[PDB]
Structure 1
Amino acid sequence: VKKFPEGFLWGVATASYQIEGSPLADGAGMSIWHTFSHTPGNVKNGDTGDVACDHYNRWKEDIEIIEKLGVKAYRFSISWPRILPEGTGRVNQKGLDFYNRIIDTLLEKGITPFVTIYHWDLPFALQLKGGWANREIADWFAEYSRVLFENFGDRVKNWITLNEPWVVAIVGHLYGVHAPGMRDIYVAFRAVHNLLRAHARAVKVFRETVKDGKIGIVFNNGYFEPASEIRAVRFMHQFNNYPLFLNPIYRGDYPELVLEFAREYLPENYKDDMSEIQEKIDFVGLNYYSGHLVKFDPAKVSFVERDLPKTAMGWEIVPEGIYWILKKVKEEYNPPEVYITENGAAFDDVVSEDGRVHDQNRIDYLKAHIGQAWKAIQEGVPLKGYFVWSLLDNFEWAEGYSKRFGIVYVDYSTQKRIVKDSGYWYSNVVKNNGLE
């Protein structure tokens, strides 16, 4: 048996645009993911977030599922454009009402809300003004955060500024694969820097407004391994993983190898912001899915395909990664608290004739990673919680509905939810506070 500490937080996680649908209901402004997915060629099968899981109407059902599974925490995000349809200025009471009902319901049912303030659905109005490229987004983000803290900070006490700011910056603004779909490296690194400045301004506002809660930030992380016998691994870790952001937050500069590669792309006087960026945070959130074999390649980095089980994303399954990254964050920055804020897998789920989804592959994946997380706890990592991505099959960004990450299956023709074997399994882990 592998039992977790008392009070350890078992959660599931979603994001607004991936599940809600009704992106323009009740006065909401367009987000950059509305406009990006309605642009031909950007998302697989022409999929959009217009309907998704219809969580906008079905929220009560979905939460009742969380309750019924005895899951203790729900990580969800708020749609900035539902709250402030032009990004700044006017506040939309019906947007506040929607999340208010969700929050109050969670608290009634004894589930701890973890709110992601930004999970990628930037108001379109602000993209017109440059979005993450514009230094002014630090103010816009502060104002938005303020509104949330003022309206919800009486009940929500666990907050996350940004989800995966590397993805926001690099995949949105260099690769052009995510909204706003840009391919400019100088824009991409100004977005990195402004994400940090916006994150830090929101923390500062938080200290002024919600004097009894906790705030952190979530990073994507891969477990990079070298193809032979190492510096490419070093760069990938410093660039793709938490150090890009944590080195500024804890040490006041970007990591060495990031500067080696990217100095020319950062603002000239970027160091002038670093003291503000060092605003103290309460926890680090790490997302982790996959491992990668890496080699130098005259980026100067390429991936090497390996044997190894893969998911439907083609991501290699390497459970020891989650242990490595947990050990590595403690070793490198020693944050007071850590959460695994996302871990999960996409498989080609089928509803069997018995009416059930026999996702033994997802159970195996989750089990292995939870065991590795447990190990890190035994070896001193202050892991306070673990969140499964995702509660529901949902809109998987540029992959559309073709990648199912849920522990609950969604039949999109009817919106029926069918708890998967992995969900039932996870429920028992939560009840038991660990593996048996």
Structure 2
Amino acid sequence: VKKFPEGFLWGVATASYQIEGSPLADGAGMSIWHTFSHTPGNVKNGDTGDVACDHYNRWKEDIEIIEKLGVKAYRFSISWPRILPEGTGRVNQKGLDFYNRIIDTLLEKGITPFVTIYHWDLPFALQLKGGWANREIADWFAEYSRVLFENFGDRVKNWITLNEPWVVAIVGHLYGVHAPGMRDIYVAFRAVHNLLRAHARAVKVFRETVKDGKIGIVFNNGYFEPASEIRAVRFMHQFNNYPLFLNPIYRGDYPELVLEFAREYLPENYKDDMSEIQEKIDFVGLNYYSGHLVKFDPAKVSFVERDLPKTAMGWEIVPEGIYWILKKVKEEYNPPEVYITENGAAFDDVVSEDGRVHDQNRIDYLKAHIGQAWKAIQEGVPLKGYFVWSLLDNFEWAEGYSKRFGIVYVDYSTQKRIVKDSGYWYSNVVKNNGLE
């Protein structure tokens, strides 16, 4: 058997724009994912978040599903433009009401809320003023965060400033594949820097406003292995994984190979902001999905396709990656607490004639990764919790509804939820507090 520590937090994770639908209900402002998904060519099949999982109406049902599965923590995000329709200034009480009902319900049912403040749905009104490219976002973000703390901080005690600021900056502003759909490397790195400053401003406000809770930040991570016998792997780690943000947070500068590549793209006096950026955080969230073979190639790095099982995303399944990144984060920055805030897989799920979804591929994926996280705990990593991405099949960004990551299947024509075998399997893992 592989049992986890007593009080280990088994969770599932979602994001507002991916599940909610009704993006314009009850006075909500438009978000950049509203405007991006409504722009032709940006998202597969013209898919948008207009309806998604209709969680905006079905939230109680979905929470009752979390409850009945015995899952102990729910990670979800708040839509900034539901709360502040223009991003700053006016507060929308109906937006607050929506999340208040979700929060109270979870608490009533003994489920621990983990709130992601920003999971990519920036108010459109602020994108007009430059979004993450504008230094003033540190103030906008801090004022938004202050509102959340004041309203919910009596009940929510676990907070995440940013989901994957690497993706926000690079995929949103260099690759142009995500909202706001830009391709400018100087904008992208100014977004990197500004995300840090906004995160640190929000942590600071948190200490003034919520004196009994905890706050952290979430990073995407890949397990990069070299194609031969390598500095390219060092670069990929420092650029794509937690060091881009943790070196500033813990050591007060960007990682060495990030500076070699991107110094010219960062603001000229960026070190002026580093001491503020070092604001103390309580935990690191790591998201992990995939491993990559990497070689130097005249960013001077390209990927090598390997055999190896892949998911529907074409992501190579490499379970030892989650152990590696867990070990490496302790070794490099030794944060006091770590959570796996997302781990999961997209497979081509089908409802069998028996009415069930027989996702053995997903069970195998989760089991392998849960086992590798168990190992990291035996070897001393302060891992406090683990979150499956995702509770539900949902809007998978530029892929639309075509990629299914849920442990619960959503039939989009009816909004029917069907617990997949992986969801039942995970329930038993949570009940048993580990594997066997």
Distance 2:253 2:301 in 1: 23
Distance 1:110 1:2 in 2: 25
Distance 1:365 1:322 in 2: 12
CA drift at 1:347 = 0.0
Distance 2:109 2:98 in 1: 17
CA drift at 1:12 = 0.0
Number of residues paired by the alignment?
Answer: 436
Question: The residue matched to 1:221 in structure 2 has which SS?
Answer: strand
Distance 1:106 1:333 in 2: 33
CA drift at 1:227 = 0.1
Distance 1:223 1:295 in 2: 13
Question: The residue matched to 1:220 in structure 2 has which SS?
Answer: strand
CA drift at 1:120 = 0.1
1:241 aligns with 2:225: no
Q: Partner residue of 1:85?
A: 85
TM-score of the superposed pair, with normalisation by structure 1: 1.00
CA drift at 1:269 = 0.1
Unaligned runs of 5+ in 2: none
Q: Deviations over 1:205-229 (max 9, x none)?
A: 0000000000000000000000000
Q: Deviations over 1:145-187 (max 9, x none)?
A: 0000000000000000000000000000000000000000000
CA drift at 1:134 = 0.1
CA drift at 1:111 = 0.0
CA drift at 1:200 = 0.1
Distance 1:260 1:245 in 2: 16
Question: The residue matched to 2:322 in structure 1 has which SS?
Answer: helix
Distance 1:96 1:187 in 2: 32
CA drift at 1:58 = 0.1
CA drift at 1:13 = 0.1
Q: Deviations over 1:97-118 (max 9, x none)?
A: 0000000000000000000000
Question: The residue matched to 1:222 in structure 2 has which SS?
Answer: strand
CA drift at 1:360 = 0.2
Question: The residue matched to 2:284 in structure 1 has which SS?
Answer: strand
Q: Partner residue of 1:378?
A: 378
Distance 1:233 1:310 in 2: 21
CA drift at 1:59 = 0.1
CA drift at 1:270 = 0.1
Unaligned runs of 5+ in 1: none
Distance 1:110 1:354 in 2: 33
CA drift at 1:404 = 0.1
Distance 1:416 1:122 in 2: 29
CA drift at 1:337 = 0.1
Question: The residue matched to 2:431 in structure 1 has which SS?
Answer: helix
Q: Deviations over 1:285-308 (max 9, x none)?
A: 000000000000001000000000
CA drift at 1:130 = 0.1
Distance 1:239 1:311 in 2: 24
Q: Deviations over 1:24-69 (max 9, x none)?
A: 0000000000000000000000000000000000000000000000
Question: The residue matched to 2:143 in structure 1 has which SS?
Answer: helix
Q: Partner residue of 2:96?
A: 96
Q: Partner residue of 2:216?
A: 216
Q: Deviations over 1:235-280 (max 9, x none)?
A: 0000000000000000000000000000000000000000000000
Q: Deviations over 1:312-343 (max 9, x none)?
A: 00000000000000000000000000000000
Q: Deviations over 1:6-25 (max 9, x none)?
A: 00000000000000000000
Distance 2:345 2:401 in 1: 14
Distance 2:29 2:377 in 1: 43
Distance 1:154 1:112 in 2: 13
Q: Calculate the aligned-residue CA RMSD, in Å.
A: 0.1
Q: Partner residue of 2:413?
A: 413
Distance 2:286 2:361 in 1: 23
CA drift at 1:389 = 0.1
Question: The residue matched to 1:178 in structure 2 has which SS?
Answer: coil
CA drift at 1:234 = 0.2
CA drift at 1:432 = 0.0
Distance 1:183 1:210 in 2: 38
Distance 2:370 2:417 in 1: 25
CA drift at 1:367 = 0.1
Q: Partner residue of 2:35?
A: 35
Distance 2:107 2:9 in 1: 15
CA drift at 1:78 = 0.1
Q: Partner residue of 2:271?
A: 271
Question: The residue matched to 2:113 in structure 1 has which SS?
Answer: strand
> Percentage identity across aligned positions?
100
Distance 2:278 2:5 in 1: 30
Question: The residue matched to 1:215 in structure 2 has which SS?
Answer: strand
